[PDB]
Design a protein around this nucleic acid. Structure first.
Lengths: 102, 86, 272, 56
RNA sequence: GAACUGCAUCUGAUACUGUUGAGCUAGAGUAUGUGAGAGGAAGGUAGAAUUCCAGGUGUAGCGGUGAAAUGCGUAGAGAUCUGGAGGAAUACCGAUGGCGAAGGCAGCCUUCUGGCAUAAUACUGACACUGAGGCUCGAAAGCGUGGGUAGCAAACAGGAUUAGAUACCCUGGUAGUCCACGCCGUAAACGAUGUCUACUAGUCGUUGGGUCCGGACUUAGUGACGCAGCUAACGCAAUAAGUA
RNA sequence: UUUAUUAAAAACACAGCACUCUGCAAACACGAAAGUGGACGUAUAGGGUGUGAUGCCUGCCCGGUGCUGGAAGGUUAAUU
């Protein structure tokens, strides 16, 4: 099952976003997972202030994995405390082309 | 739910002729597999009345098919319920 | 869960027992056991200082590891036992080195799973962590108050505490009493709700069942003579006075809290 | 043709200056693509690529 | 004499009903590909707004009404700004739009799951329709146990109005509304129209598919009109209340 | 269960129910204090009070006296 997940990380904690991402890439790829797309949208001006901040670091990555690894990733996003928001979506296909936002 | 692979496994096991997938035996075997698979879902969501309606419908259809076989070929009905454990 | 007794006897008509088929049917681990004799609610002066205490079944003390300082050594839950000393269940822990201990069993804790203690421990029921390594909003129990002293709060059956936030070196907790309190962030807590959540759903059924637990009968103050109780006296049934204890202390709203040293550790209370 | 919640530039002209979704009777869009528009706009609002309202 | 519409037993007929053997595909089902949807169940989460709490500014009103008054407010309200707690509902989209057997079902995401629509091929070969008793589900209110409790609010309290006012209006306000698991089994539960099948002028919308060349056609819904027919009349009229 | 020795009961207790207190060196009790019980317990716990299985339930009154919250004002000790 393909999953398109967008992460919203704190602008202060943007220096560790690369390790943040590669941790999840390693977790997915270990369990026979495929990273069909990965992009970092960068710092973006939020339309509304989240948690009293006005900019945030956006990272999108479409992957393919199983339910158990999805639950592992969901728990990691929840307890990371640097990811201030997340959106996990189920996609029918695998999306590889660069998104219009990047 | 059942997948295409195990649905084709059931069809191939209860084939009456070549690629028939429409005899009472194959229909009843598919219904039995689907009902036994949905028992797991209903052990988890027992308040699901809308899905349970469809489950009841496939039970009724399986019963009608078994009655039709009993009237059509008695030995065939007995053998089929013997494999399927009904 | 709860099972009702059939009304075969008038003393059975209202028995609702808590039944746990998953509790150990055998005997407790004998090394973690101590002799423990009843007081009858009498102190070293021999005087009754706590009323309505007497009799009951003989019971051993199980030595509970409330401190949980075997950090970074995984333990497996060998069994879940009934404890006569408390309402909660107790999990027998078997550490990697073979040492066995008793802990308070969390509600979502079963036989076979591994518990951990320390700072780098997963957020799973049964693990013991300092309050600073516990994310806000999780249900915790067995809260320390002094650093290193052991769990004191939220230990009864069904106990849970909400970790609301942090305001420096203090963690903000909401207790089942409805009190918001601060506890030093270096104190520990255990993840999860305490087992035996249907403790208060049980019904003793008869007077003898209360006697089996070491509770002696309780005589109302208005049933006495004035030489015994402030409520004693009267021709027929009468109260006549504001309610008080047998020592003249009001029992209908009068607050009895003296501690001026701990006053600054309490944020607020709830009003319902 | 097709529509996604990352098409923020496309979603800007189907949302009013106060942040409300513009109705189909005004934009002229079909019911199916209006439904996809609405769900994409709500997802973008959650991701904070669009505002819910103009006074946060 | 006729009749006694009857019964019984033989004989003949085989169109229809029954019982049977074989065959068939058009009713009904199956497999495979696409599609739409507030269908159901379990979790998580977001943003507005209310209330409460704690503070900064600030000062004499606020609130409410047809007027008022009760009420709140100089112990500093309301207004304004900043933090915190919590509960419930999901503006816009939104639509004689959609889905569901009905009751019903709207933020967003994941998981589990039902039905439906659609093109073609293959398959079974009447497996169908209806259905007394029965069983299941079944709005809201209500009941039990355990939680929750922001707003709204039966009861209840006060203020008005009034001849009176157990009301309508105002200010508060508890059960309830929310959750879990169970009971209840009722509604103008309505289309006041049982279900299923076939046939019978037409015109214009809309939803989900499909096929052709922005239209054309064809399907399954969902609307507005309107013949014949029907109706006591109103009206219904391929989603019949027409013809069976 | 109870008035040993004129009262065994409708009295007391009782499971059950409610109110209230108590964040742990708990409240509460013994004690002059040390030390104890509560409890090697921890708000699903412990104390006090009332009521007394269960069924259906439990209306109005906060004037008085208590209890709880508040502090604008008046009064107010030693002291100085």
């Amino acid at each position: 099952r393909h999953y398109e997940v967008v992460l919203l990380v704190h602008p202060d904690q943007s220096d560790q976003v690369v390790g943040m991402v590669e941790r999840y890439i390693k977790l997915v790829q270990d369990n026979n997972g495929i990273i069909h797309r990965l992009e970092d949208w960068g710092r973006r001006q939020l339309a509304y202030p989240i948690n009293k901040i006005h900019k945030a670091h956006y990272v999108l990555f479409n992957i393919e994995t199983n339910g158990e690894t999805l639950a592992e990733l969901e728990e990691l996003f929840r307890y990371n405390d640097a990811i201030i928001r997340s959106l996990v979506m189920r996609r029918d296909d695998a999306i590889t082309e660069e998104s219009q936002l990047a | 739910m059942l997948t295409n692979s195990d649905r084709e496994q059931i069809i191939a096991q209860y084939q009456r002729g070549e690629n028939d997938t429409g005899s009472p035996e194959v229909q009843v075997a598919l219904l039995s597999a689907r009902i036994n698979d949905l028992q797991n879902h209903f052990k988890a969501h027992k308040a699901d009345h809308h899905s349970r309606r469809g489950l009841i419908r496939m039970v009724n259809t399986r019963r009608k098919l078994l009655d039709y076989l009993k009237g059509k070929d008695l030995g065939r009905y007995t053998t089929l319920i013997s494999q399927l454990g009904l | 869960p709860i099972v009702k007794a059939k009304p075969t006897s008038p003393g059975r008509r209202f028995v609702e027992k808590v039944v746990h088929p998953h509790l150990y049917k055998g005997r407790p681990f004998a090394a973690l056991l101590e002799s423990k004799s009843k007081t009858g609610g009498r102190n070293n002066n021999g005087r009754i200082t706590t009323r309505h205490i007497g009799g009951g079944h003989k019971q051993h003390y199980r030595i509970i590891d409330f401190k949980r300082t075997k950090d970074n050594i995984p333990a497996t839950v060998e069994r879940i036992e009934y404890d006569p000393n408390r309402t909660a269940h107790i999990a027998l822990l078997k550490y990697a080195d073979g040492e066995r201990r008793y802990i308070i069993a969390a509600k979502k804790q079963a036989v076979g799973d591994t518990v951990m203690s320390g700072e780098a421990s997963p957020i799973r029921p049964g693990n013991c962590l300092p309050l600073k390594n516990i994310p806000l909003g999780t249900v915790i129990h067995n809260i320390e108050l002094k650093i290193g002293k052991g769990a004191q709060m939220a230990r009864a059956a069904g106990a849970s505490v909400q970790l609301l936030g942090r305001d420096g070196i203090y963690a903000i907790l909401r207790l089942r009493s409805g009190e918001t309190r601060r506890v030093h962030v270096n104190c520990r807590a255990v993840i999860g709700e305490v087992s035996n959540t249907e403790n208060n759903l049980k019904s003793l059924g008869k007077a003898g069942a209360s006697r089996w637990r070491g509770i002696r009968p309780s005589v109302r103050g208005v049933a006495m003579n004035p030489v015994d109780h402030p409520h004693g006296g009267g021709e027929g049934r009468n109260k006549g006075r504001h309610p008080t204890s047998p020592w003249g202390q009001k029992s209908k709203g009068l607050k009895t809290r003296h501690n001026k040293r701990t006053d600054s550790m309490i944020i607020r209370r709830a009003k319902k | 043709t097709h529509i996604d919640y990352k098409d923020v530039e496309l979603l800007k002209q189907y949302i009013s200056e106060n942040g409300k979704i513009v109705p189909s009777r005004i934009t002229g869009t079909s019911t199916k693509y209006q439904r996809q528009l609405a769900t994409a706009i709500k997802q973008a609002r959650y991701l904070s690529l669009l505002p819910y309202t103009d006074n946060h």
